[PDB]
Design a protein around this ligand. Structure first.
Ligand SMILES: C[C@@H]1O[C@H](O)[C@@H](O)[C@H](O)[C@@H]1O
Ligand SMILES: C[C@@H]1O[C@H](O)[C@@H](O)[C@H](O)[C@@H]1O
Ligand SMILES: C[C@@H]1O[C@H](O)[C@@H](O)[C@H](O)[C@@H]1O
Ligand SMILES: C[C@@H]1O[C@H](O)[C@@H](O)[C@H](O)[C@@H]1O
Lengths: 424, 424, 422, 422
């Protein structure tokens, strides 16, 4: 049993499933998906993030304001998008199947982003998906489908920012130091809402954002102890601004962390986003391997449309990643870091290392065109280095500081995207 | 005038009436009286307290859950008892007469227990006796009747626990450290509700329970100063978790205290309670004398049914106590502690001492069967020891460390339950 | 057992001995007794308190500065008085006997006043009576003598003010809000010194003054718990500025215990330029205070050589001669239903209770046999003349209570007519 | 780089060496080793811990007081033992070699226990081993010797208790809530002393005790950041009473790292009146603790002259002889899917993992060849006898796992039967 104080909650280390998961799906989906628009220290004036539509719209000068006033009209309040957000062609089982085939082991939707619209039937505001728009508990139905597909389910919550409680926009990063809800009322509201998510859906991950209101930071001792006592395999990110977290986030470490990025640049759906603002399947795999070899997990974001469909370009990149993970999944899932993160060849091709007990997977970022491969600054523990995908044994010798190794061309042609070897 | 700070509020000592009162009636009565059921470190799983019905019901495993799901059905929410709680045959004048005849000098009902149902027309929740169930201000009508009978009126309030603000039950004592309302919203709610009781009924006693929310502990400086300034003869118990109290509670001291217990084991009405889970009239009198000789008051609880009647077994024990207090009341009411609490005879019979200026009442817990009574470790201040109930003088001498004294058998037969003497 | 937190320490009510004590002796005695001088909006510029000599001296051109610069010289540092404080003719048994004969039940000397000179062998400063001046543990020798005489022994300590830690004087009351030691170093120093008094002498009273340093206020839950656990009959005044105290102080009827403090004269420390109360006014004060639930802490300001001025000795013995006669109507009494009353004539009256007995103490001796007391009805008891025990006839008349006490008995009483109803 | 705030310091997880270390030596050694005496609701009145000699001595009439007043005399102050603590026959290389042969990977001496005597040349008190007694920097010479033997070196420090700053003893556990130094002066003193240990010896472990003074708890975000930035492989226990620690202590399977501490005997400091564990019980403790994710910190209580009692030396060497054989199944291991298991016979079993290898350590040596382990199914690997490496036949049978190990191999093992599946 966890007690409600920081010393006691430190006893909760990161759960084993999360360290082994390696890959998860972020989902940025709200009423901001309806307009789904964004421009292709002037960051907030030309916000490339479609989720920040309302903030950009509150800046009268901006291109989001130009677009909005021409597409929808000057007197079209942002709140009106809630009724346009009908998710009429949303099938959560189809999402869960997509994410499972993509190779993800956990899924995290935005229960409530900065605009403050909640994607569940919360009883603390009427600005949610049950009373407005979809007339449907989006979080709960996604949680059911995700878990029926055999995946873990987390929740993103914008604890630090809620624009239902402000009127002024963020124009500069320094504005965030005072343009917050700021009231005791909000501190209670955020506490009750995350407590409600825990009670209703018992998430495997509590992914807070933008810090936690200062007035309720000491509430989290009670929230975290409550959560862990109901769900010891539950986890908590590092965006609460308090002494406790299970893993860190980012946009060889001894702690666990998680790199988050979108398939594109924007997190929410953006129409203005060209097909060359997005990563290729190759770049997604390279990111996954790089991150995972450094002890991290990848949280890859998906920005679905307001009608509940995932853009074909995004579906494509997910399935292509999962086709790669279906072949090379044994060298990623359930792996630890090796003695070192990275390495390169004499040629130039970068290399990453993942361990799985006595095995050491050697993952080349790319497929070398030559049979004779020379890896710099490595002298392997004289064992048995073998081709991974076919299993076939391979000859190799040590040379001063580098490591020479021949791999026939007949085997290179089998590998897709990355050549991977495996020592013992 | 009291200032709102702890140093200043210390000037308020316990009121004279309360120290002299000696005996009071607790009343545990709510919507939990309707089901009125309880099982005959596993305490919370088999709670013998019927007031904790809802907590026990939230534990799916428990016998309260078995009973509830069979008597009322799985989908019978606990809140539904509010509408079953009609107090149709409740007459408060009949209660006040009962408590007055029982010998009580003050009466304290549960305005709001842990379940959060209020027995008055509070304007801070619709979960009360005016909007639901009785359609009647139960606290106010009891206050009128109690005061018309010439008794003081206090209020119990569950400041520390309110299950209207939680969903999870208490399974272990350590759960109480974090399964509390916890919000600023609740701290205000509790403050406004006790302030409302003060404004509406001006209670002679403020009997808080389960501590006060940490977020509003400093509010009580303002509450206590406000209260004492309107009502200097008002009093305050020791369950707020702050530096100030007028008397302590429990379940020779220099401070004033108050032992609270039920006629039975449960505080709320329990049907499952046999007639041999309750104290006899003899044991109630023995408790009263023991407590009062140690500087304390007795707060004897009554658990009425949901229809507003007090079980005949409880009525019986109260009237029998009051018949005893009608005879021996002069040795209890308005007494102080003597040089020592207790004493025993050579035979074995225990003895308690109460003072009233130059008088010293000697109350035997039981009626010795022999005329020759030898009291251990006592040498009285050579005065005049007399039989109390008849007044008749009695012979006595000192003997080493003990004190011999003859009391004719004709006088023993007059005394009911306790022989009592009286020195000068 | 007492825990170190305010909620737990509230369980310590005022000890029974202190409530019954009624009368105690304050002693303001230090190196300020050596010059022992004070002048006969601008209170601090013309301080009538001789203990504040150093503060007044730091105010250049003030009358204490004029006197000092002429009697001792401009370059005569105040600290130099420590070596002049010899306590030549000091006899603690003589003091303890004087206070016992005066009728006092407890005695409280200044272990350290605002100037910061300590009257004991403290190991936290060398500015004390053992290393300087008397070469003698003044507090400890007085404690031994006072307890041998059968009296309780308390300690005054200036926790809030210490002029060893400041250089600027107090010219106005608002100056006290910032001209304090202010350092963590001082907060520890004060804690360690009161801890040391407790360890060395285990005082029955801890009489702090001028509040406690803000930084050390949380230290006192520990100090008080430590103190009460070693000495449950110990007590603590109300000048720490924290939620806990046993009795209040002061310079219808309260439910708490309090203590009026005042000197025989106006000054607390010895003053030559000294305005003194008569024996009659001291008795009247005692009775007034005691009938209102309070104790009287009467101050004595001895000279630097260790003798108590004859005028002060005289007032104390005269008070004790009165207390020897009428002590049963004061010591061990509680308050009655009301404190005060007057006669049709004008003479004020005070009431003390002692169980079923209720003493009626006249502030003065009425010159007439027929006495009419206003707004008082006594439930037909037996009103006795107190000192002789003789019975007196009384009747109830409307609001008032007519009583007839013979001339023989009025001339018997000294200072106060005292009756005794039941 | 680590910033001085709790959120940043959480990034420091327990160092890999400490998780792999498994076994370490505690050393309770001070001036309390000189008398080295302790008696065979009232724990503090009959303290079995010889390190608490002074506390027990402050309790007048207690058995430590009887012994002390007869062996040394009533006017023999406890502080006088500092001059008796000569460490005559002390040889740090002899100690370091003993601990290395015992199989320990790290060593932690008491730099300062509750009595406040420091075993190094601190410049914040003259009550230490350089100015008194040994005339020698005991901590530094042990640190040099321990690191020369190839072992890690930590430091115990009594941050929460220091009896140089109190006079009253601890009679009950509730006394610890207020009988502490309590001053800002102490909070600085503790900070400066641990800062000084870090600067002088850069310990691999900072083993604080009895919490950290309330006034100095915020100082520790700075001390910890300073420490980790100079020494990232450094570690910190859980007895500071702040949000941060690297491992917990103690006197299904945890996710955090912890450390069981206990003496060879009952007392931590040397006791004559001493109740000791056998070699078998020490090995059983080590295996039990290690299979549950913990380390064992085994205490040694040397005499005042600098020698370790032969009985203690004996137990340590016997443990190291066992660890020399079975060290591969302990050092560098993680926890398995579950900690514990038993046979149909009754013999307890513990599991340690080392990648794909899973060691099966029997607490005792089964007398029969046919061994049936309850509730255990092993995925058909290759179960080897550990010490000889020979292969063993096994079958899965319902819930259990039948295995046949020849008598030849059971008689080979010492204390524990050890197998090795894959
Ligand atoms: C994952 C990203 O985190 C950031 O803090 C947010 O501002 C973005 O909108 C997005 O949710
Ligand atoms: C008098 C008793 O006090 C306790 O704290 C409560 O838990 C019981 O329900 C009851 O009200
Ligand atoms: C009793 C008086 O208390 C005051 O606070 C002090 O300033 C006086 O010097 C005197 O000691
Ligand atoms: C390891 C033990 O820790 C406890 O806190 C101490 O009181 C003992 O003396 C010993 O050092």
């Amino acid at each position: 049993r966890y007690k409600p104080d920081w010393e006691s909650l430190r006893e909760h280390t990161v759960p084993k499933w999360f360290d082994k998961a390696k890959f998860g799906i972020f989902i940025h989906w709200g009423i901001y998906s309806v307009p789904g628009w964004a421009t292709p220290d002037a960051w907030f004036f030309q916000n490339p993030y479609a989720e920040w539509y309302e903030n950009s719209l509150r800046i009268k000068e901006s291109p989001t304001w130009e677009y909005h006033v021409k597409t929808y009209g000057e007197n079209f309040e942002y709140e009106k998008f809630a009724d346009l957000f009908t998710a009429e062609k949303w099938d959560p089982q189809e999402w869960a199947d997509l994410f499972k085939k993509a190779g993800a082991k956990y899924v995290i939707p935005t229960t409530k982003h900065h605009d403050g619209f909640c994607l569940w039937g919360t009883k603390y505001t009427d600005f949610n998906s049950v009373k407005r728009g979809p007339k449907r508990d989006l979080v709960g139905d996604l949680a059911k489908a995700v878990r029926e597909a055999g995946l873990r389910f987390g929740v993103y919550y914008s604890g630090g920012l809620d624009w239902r409680f402000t009127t002024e926009p963020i124009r500069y990063p320094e504005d965030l130091s005072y343009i917050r809800p700021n009231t005791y009322e909000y501190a209670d509201y955020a506490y009750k809402q995350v407590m409600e998510l825990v009670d209703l859906y018992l998430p495997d991950v509590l992914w807070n954002d933008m810090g936690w209101p200062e007035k309720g930071k000491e509430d989290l001792k009670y929230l975290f102890a409550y959560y862990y006592n109901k769900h010891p395999e539950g986890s908590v990110n590092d965006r609460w601004g308090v002494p406790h977290w299970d893993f860190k986030t980012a946009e060889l470490p001894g702690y666990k962390w998680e790199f988050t990025r979108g398939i594109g640049l924007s997190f929410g759906y953006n129409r203005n986003e060209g097909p060359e603002h997005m990563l290729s399947v190759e770049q997604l795999v390279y990111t996954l391997v790089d991150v995972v070899s450094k002890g991290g997990n990848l949280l890859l974001n998906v920005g679905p449309k307001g009608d509940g469909t995932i853009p074909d370009l995004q579906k494509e990149r997910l399935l292509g990643l999962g086709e790669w993970l279906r072949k090379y999944g044994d060298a990623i899932y359930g792996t630890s870091v090796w003695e070192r993160c990275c390495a390169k060849t004499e040629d130039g091709t970068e290399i990453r290392f993942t361990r799985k007990c006595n095995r050491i997977f050697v993952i080349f970022l790319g497929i070398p065109t030559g049979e004779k491969i020379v890896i710099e600054d490595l002298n392997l523990s004289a064992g048995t280095v073998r081709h991974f995908l076919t299993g076939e044994r391979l000859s190799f010798k040590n040379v001063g500081k580098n490591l020479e190794i021949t791999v026939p061309k007949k085997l290179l042609e089998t590998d897709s995207i990355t050549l991977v070897l495996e020592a013992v």
